[PDB]
Swiss-Prot record:
S-adenosyl-L-methionine binds at W24, W28, W35, G62, D83, D111, V112, Y127. Its EC number is 2.1.1.n4. Expressed in shoots, leaves, stems, inflorescences, flowers and green siliques. Disruption phenotype: No visible phenotype under normal growth conditions. Increased sensitivity to thiocyanate in medium and lower methyl halide emissions. It is an enzyme of class 2 (transferase). PROSITE patterns: SAM_MT_TPMT (PS51585). GO terms for cellular component: cytosol; plasma membrane. This is Thiocyanate methyltransferase 1. It comes from the Eukaryota. GO terms for biological process: defense response; glucosinolate catabolic process; methylation. GO terms for molecular function: thiocyanate methyltransferase activity; thiol S-methyltransferase activity.
Amino acid sequence: GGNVIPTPEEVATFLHKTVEEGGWEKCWEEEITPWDQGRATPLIVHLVDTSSLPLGRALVPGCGGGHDVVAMASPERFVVGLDISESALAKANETYGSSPKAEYFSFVKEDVFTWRPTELFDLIFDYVFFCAIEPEMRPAWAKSMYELLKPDGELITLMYPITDHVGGPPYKVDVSTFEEVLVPIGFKAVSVEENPHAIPTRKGKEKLGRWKKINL
Ligand SMILES: Nc1ncnc2c1ncn2[C@@H]1O[C@H](CSCC[C@H](N)C(=O)O)[C@@H](O)[C@H]1O
Ligand SMILES: [Cl-]
């Protein structure tokens, strides 16, 4: 029974007020976290349990409370959760840090736009991060996705929120918003599909995309 958080359209009316006052860290300190599902994203649980996510090294940018990081972690899928908020990662570690999966994941306080480890990622899963950033950061987001992926890596975007609302975060997006920043830098969409596991407040407001680099 997970229909307990506001629609993206409702979140967009107030979230900016705290982000503008004290950043994402203030949101986390004050428990103003209306994007947070309180559990792993149902689509992610489904894809993990049907072996429909690639194995290897995975990155979850703007991971927040880290639910999806932990759901994706396994002996063959090492997952890095990246967030700039100390309080977000404190909460993630408080919740999940003692999981037997702890040797297979790491919560790392780093900025997606600038952090570059020596070992890159087979997989990046972006959900509620592309829409969190200021709209003008979007071409830089695309270049960061390119740079953080190995040459045969895959970017998986749960593209959200596909809505008509004004303001943000979360800022409205559509498939063309992703295509416009990803294609010119050498990604190609493998497919774009509905998410039949969308929670009610997000049903019809998100689509799953898989992106690969056109040149190896
Ligand atoms: N440059 C950056 N690098 C890493 N994390 C960032 C960031 N800018 C914002 N964030 C983080 O992005 C998160 C957006 S909220 C979404 C959290 C998570 N994706 C979820 O679905 O629940 C916040 O936790 C915020 O601290
Ligand atoms: Cl579109």
